[PDB]
Amino acid sequence: MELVLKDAQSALTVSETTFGRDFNEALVHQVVVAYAAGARQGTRAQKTFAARPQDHSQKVNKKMYRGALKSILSELVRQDRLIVVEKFSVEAPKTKLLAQKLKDMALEDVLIITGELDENLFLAARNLHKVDVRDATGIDPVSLIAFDKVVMTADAVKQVEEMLA
Amino acid sequence: AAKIRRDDEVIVLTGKDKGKRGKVKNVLSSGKVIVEGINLVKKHQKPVPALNQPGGIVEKEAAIQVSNVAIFNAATGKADRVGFRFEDGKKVRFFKSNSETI
RNA sequence: UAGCGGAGCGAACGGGGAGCAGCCCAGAGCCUGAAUCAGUGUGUGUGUUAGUGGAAGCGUCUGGAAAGGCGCGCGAUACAGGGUGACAGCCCCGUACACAAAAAUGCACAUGCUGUGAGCUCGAUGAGUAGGGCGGGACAUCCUGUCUGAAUAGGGGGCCAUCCUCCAAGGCUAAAUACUCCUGACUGACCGAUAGUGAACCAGUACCGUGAGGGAAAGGCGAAAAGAACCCCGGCGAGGGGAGUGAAAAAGAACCUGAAACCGUGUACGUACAAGCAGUGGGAGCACGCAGGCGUGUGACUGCGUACCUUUUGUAUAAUGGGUCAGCGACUUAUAUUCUGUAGCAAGGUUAACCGAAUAGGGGAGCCGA
């Protein structure tokens, strides 16, 4: 499974089981719901019943979690929501530069994931509400679905595949 | 650090008297300022035998929120924002937008 | 689980982690006072207790008022949040970020002084003690008030040894752990005035009780009091009618919204020869609103018609319960276990604690299956 880049227009072949797997709606629904339930602080009580603080955390099998990532990640390729570039960085930590760098690419709501997070890139995108920046190690299933487009650097895709399959 | 003092010419940004200018009579601790000729109200002050034997309807000035007024430059003829720097050991106000010292 | 007991109670070894530190005395000499620990200043750092700077917006429409709509710009290491006459990244306070301390003080070092001894050598190696007796206590076992009494490198454990392992009869000991009256910050598929703490309000108050103690109700004018000058009726009242303020007074303080029961005034129709769950089917007339009937309200007359609930086989020619309205008010949470559905991987499945600011990954100790 090779995807054509934008700047260099080259290819990067990856296992179809990663970027070309079927969409498991039930599996994705389970994992996405699990993440949302895991983040809530269920602290409440009354004082006819009365509530107690509770843990909404659910278990996700290590292999089962990766399987959900493959299905959503593959769906991005089929939906053409995945843009791959060789290089993506800014000279200085200025959000204005990030805005100009994005309108040229015709991207408004984008998730930018990089192999090695740059300090300037992170700071520049901090004040852009529709732009999020992650590192290859710090990717998250919910984020990959929420954002309209996903920009990945050449290093990131290589790291992601070895981390996934 | 108030950006407005007792003696200052200001222009009302919003309200019944938007655009009118006047001199601040005094500033209240509640975040409001009284400006000459702004926000006139008609108080029906009932006479009291001890003082103010005449009654009648009396026009008086009502306080205005400090956020509803801005320092009037009088050079550009429009509202302006105030910045604070440390000059010669006393931090004074200056007009942003050409950064001129009052 | 091993076991103890029926109901129930419940290890240890061992393994994986958190944290790790073991010291001096039981006595002398040498050597020096050398590490180290305490007291104590003194310098530096790093906080804490005040603070300082902190980017960028105008035009027009509606409106009581612009932050809203529309149009055209700008800042962003700052689009956390709050306020401003309606909903503000660019009005205000802030925020990101960068700085700040005369004084006190936390915490690390550096160093001053004091007190303290490290290094090496040699020895010692816990006595009315180990043990045993008596009388009790507590459950053959344990404890001891009383009396007796060793060996001491040999002594203490594991019918007998074996073999292994240990050294009582002195003391000290950080870290990993528990908890939160109190303080700060943040968070919430938490409540929003009959809720949430009993208490959003001058609440542990008023009130109740001799007392311990029990224990309420009660939030909201408006952007701004601009809280109604003046006039009129009235008792120099209460209350009202004007006027005036305001976008709004049917926002007037008994003040946002203003439901229902309940009480009236007005209009339409019916009703004083007509018998009972009061409705339902048919239906004249009247009033009104719409090519001649329909609609809305009323309902003369007429067919049919044992209130509802619970108990009970049953609704009963029985008994029970409810004055009405509004509000509150009952299969919740955790754990174990079983089944069904569904999803993952597959003869393998899966990790727990924990590490890791990290939901990733590591961790295979264990568990169930083959």
From Swiss-Prot, chain A:
Looking up InterPro entries in the UniProt record yields: Ribosomal_uL4, Ribosomal_uL4-like, Ribosomal_uL4_dom_sf
Effect of substituting A124V? Does not regulate the S10 operon; assembles into ribosomes in vivo
Q: Which Gene Ontology molecular function entries are recorded, alphabetically? A: DNA binding; endoribonuclease inhibitor activity; mRNA 5'-UTR binding; RNA-binding transcription regulator activity; rRNA binding; structural constituent of ribosome; translation repressor activity
Gene3D superfamilies in alphabetical order: 3.40.1370.10
Q: Name one GO cellular component term.
A: cytosol
**SUPFAM superfamilies given in the database record:** Ribosomal protein L4
Q: Which UniProt keywords apply?
A: Antibiotic resistance, Repressor, Ribonucleoprotein, Ribosomal protein, RNA-binding, rRNA-binding, Transcription, Transcription regulation, Transcription termination, Translation regulation
Which GO terms fall under biological process for this protein?
cytoplasmic translation; DNA-templated transcription termination; negative regulation of cytoplasmic translation; negative regulation of DNA-templated transcription; negative regulation of translation; response to antibiotic; ribosome assembly; transcriptional attenuation
Instruction: Tell me yes or no: is Ribosomal protein among this UniProt entry's keywords.
Output: yes
Q: What is the effect of changing V131D?
A: Does not regulate the S10 operon in vivo
Q: Which domain of life is it from?
A: Bacteria
Which family is this protein grouped under?
A: Belongs to the universal ribosomal protein uL4 family.
Q: What does this protein do?
A: One of the primary rRNA binding proteins, this protein initially binds near the 5'-end of the 23S rRNA. It is important during the early stages of 50S assembly. It makes multiple contacts with different domains of the 23S rRNA in the assembled 50S subunit and ribosome.
The extra comment attached to this record reads: The erythromycin sensitive allele is dominant over the resistant allele.
Q: NCBIfam families of this UniProt entry?
A: rplD_bact
- Cross-referenced HAMAP family: Ribosomal_uL4_B
Q: How does it assemble?
A: Part of the 50S ribosomal subunit. In TnaC-stalled ribosomes forms part of the binding pocket for L-Trp with the leader peptide and uL22.
What protein is this chain from?
Answer: Large ribosomal subunit protein uL4
Annotated organism of origin: Escherichia coli (strain K12)
From Swiss-Prot, chain B:
Q: Which UniProt keywords apply?
A: Ribonucleoprotein, Ribosomal protein, RNA-binding, rRNA-binding
Which InterPro entries does its entry note? Answer: KOW, Rib_uL2_dom2, Ribosomal_uL24, Ribosomal_uL24_CS, Ribosomal_uL24_KOW, Translation_prot_SH3-like_sf
Keyword match Transcription regulation: no
**Organism superkingdom:** Bacteria
Q: Name one GO molecular function term.
A: large ribosomal subunit rRNA binding
Gene3D superfamilies per the UniProt record, alphabetical: 2.30.30.30
Q: Which GO terms describe its cellular component?
A: cytoplasm; cytosol; cytosolic large ribosomal subunit
Q: Name one GO biological process term.
A: ribosomal large subunit assembly
What PANTHER family does this protein's entry cite?
Answer: MITOCHONDRIAL RIBOSOMAL PROTEIN L24
Q: How does it assemble?
A: Part of the 50S ribosomal subunit. Might contact the SecYEG translocation complex when it is docked with the ribosome.
Q: What does this protein do?
A: One of two assembly initiator proteins, it binds directly to the 5'-end of the 23S rRNA, where it nucleates assembly of the 50S subunit. It is not thought to be involved in the functions of the mature 50S subunit in vitro.
Assigned protein family: Belongs to the universal ribosomal protein uL24 family.
Q: This chain belongs to which protein, by name? A: Large ribosomal subunit protein uL24
Native species: Escherichia coli (strain K12)
Source taxonomy lineage?
A: Bacteria, Pseudomonadati, Pseudomonadota, Gammaproteobacteria, Enterobacterales
Q: Which gene encodes it?
A: rplX
